[PDB]
């Protein structure tokens, strides 16, 4: 990570403390990595956190110098999703080859499989992509979260 960005990373990390010690609760790590344009899965984050425990995940803290070493470790990975397959999976919920899925079925799956999201999480996501018939076009929603 060129100092150019590393220099800015700090600007982002710093831009993450409600009080002021200059520490990111073991929890925040995830969002801070994300904010830095990272899409680490929920596991990829714990793995580099020593797999703590809920309780201590709200007590433990972080300092950029000890955080940076993780930002990268993640940064360099083996895979990533992509329209190609990403949508290929949602298209399996397309009731009748319409090319669209019901914002309720999409809202389900997303909160009942794998890294289960929250009712609100999905709400905030799909919200505004459902049509008159509450129909979402994955192809697009895919790109949205993606290219976005």
């Amino acid at each position: 990570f060129s100092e150019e960005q590393t220099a800015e990373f700090k600007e982002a990390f710093q831009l993450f403390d409600r009080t002021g010690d200059g520490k990111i609760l073991y929890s925040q790590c995830g969002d801070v990595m994300r904010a830095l344009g990272q899409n680490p899965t929920n596991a990829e984050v714990m793995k580099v956190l020593g797999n703590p425990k809920s309780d201590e995940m709200n007590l433990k803290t972080l300092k950029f110098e000890q955080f940076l070493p993780m930002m990268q470790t993640i940064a360099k990975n083996k895979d990533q999703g992509c329209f190609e397959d990403y949508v290929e999976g949602l298209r399996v919920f397309d009731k009748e080859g319409n090319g669209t899925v019901m914002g309720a079925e999409i809202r389900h799956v997303l909160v009942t499989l794998g890294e289960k999201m929250t009712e609100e999480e999905v709400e905030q996501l799909v919200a505004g992509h459902e049509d008159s018939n509450g129909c979402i076009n994955y192809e697009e929603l895919v790109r949205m979260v993606l290219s976005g």
């Binding site: 949508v87 290929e88 949602l90 298209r91 397309d94 080859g97």
Partner: protein
């Protein structure tokens, strides 16, 4: 009527401007090369022009008829599909090229005789001409890009395959890419599409007769689907055109002419029917 004020050199009214650019549009999705005419009108047409009391043009309707959209799937020997197709496969911009998954010619199976050329006509430019027209007419910048993907779509849906299955005897979708793409352009979904396309979760009479068709049926549908998805377009544009062009009216009738090739299908029957019809009118 004029805003006051050499060959085609002349600034026409505002509507007469469009009234002029209409026919060059329907000519795209509607005309195609045949053993009798490089740019044949593949559908009867009856244009109606409306005049006020002072004698000025004010409106214009267009009653389209028998659109032989059959050929949208399989063209006879030395014949072509609806111009627009070729126009697109070529006039397509590099960017938008992929945007509709517009592989080159002969990468699509709906184009029999591969890519056949038309004498004295350059499809390359032909595109812009019609593109240009569409704008003159009124089709929103994007309002067009769309009418184009729906075209590629009507072509990809042709790649989709269904190879028999000597085990179950219900051909399947050995390849995703095909419908994979197609379903994207449709704003619909794969899995669903697939099932629906292979296993009709139908509902006959007082029963949810869930069944699965045979390789063939698997296509007669994916085929007669795109084929009708097309017509759904023509009829659409026609009402988009007719939306701008619109005490007295002048009627101009351009029916399709007595045509009689090798395979004298149904189409040729109603066509040569009307022709016999009209003539009798003159006789009366």
């Amino acid at each position: 009527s004029h805003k006051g004020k050499q060959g085609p050199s002349f600034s026409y009214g505002e509507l007469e401007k469009q009234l002029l650019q209409a026919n060059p549009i329907l000519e795209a999705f509607g005309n195609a090369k045949t053993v009798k005419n490089d740019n044949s009108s593949r559908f009867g047409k009856f244009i109606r022009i409306n005049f006020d009391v002072t004698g000025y043009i004010v409106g214009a309707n267009i009653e389209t008829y028998l659109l032989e959209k059959s050929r949208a799937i399989r063209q006879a020997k030395d014949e072509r599909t609806f111009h627009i197709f070729y126009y697109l496969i070529a006039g397509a911009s590099e960017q938008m090229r992929n945007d509709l998954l517009l592989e080159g010619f002969n990468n699509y199976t709906f184009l029999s005789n591969g890519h056949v050329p038309i004498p004295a006509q350059q499809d390359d430019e032909m595109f812009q001409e019609t593109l240009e027209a569409m704008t003159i007419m009124g089709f929103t910048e994007e309002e067009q890009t769309s009418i184009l993907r729906v075209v590629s779509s009507v072509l990809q849906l042709g790649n989709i395959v269904f190879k028999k299955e000597r085990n179950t005897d219900q051909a399947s979708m050995p390849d995703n890419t095909a419908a994979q793409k197609v379903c994207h352009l449709m704003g619909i979904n794969v899995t669903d599409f697939t099932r629906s396309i292979l296993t009709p979760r139908i509902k006959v009479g007082r029963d949810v007769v869930q069944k699965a068709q045979t390789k063939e049926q698997a296509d007669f549908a994916i085929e007669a689907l795109a084929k009708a998805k097309f017509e759904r377009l023509f009829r659409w544009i026609l009402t988009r055109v007719n939306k701008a062009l619109d005490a007295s009216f002048l009627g101009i009738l351009d029916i399709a002419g007595f045509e009689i090739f090798e395979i004298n299908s149904f189409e040729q029957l109603c066509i040569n029917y009307t022709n016999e019809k009209l003539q009798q009118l003159f006789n009366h």
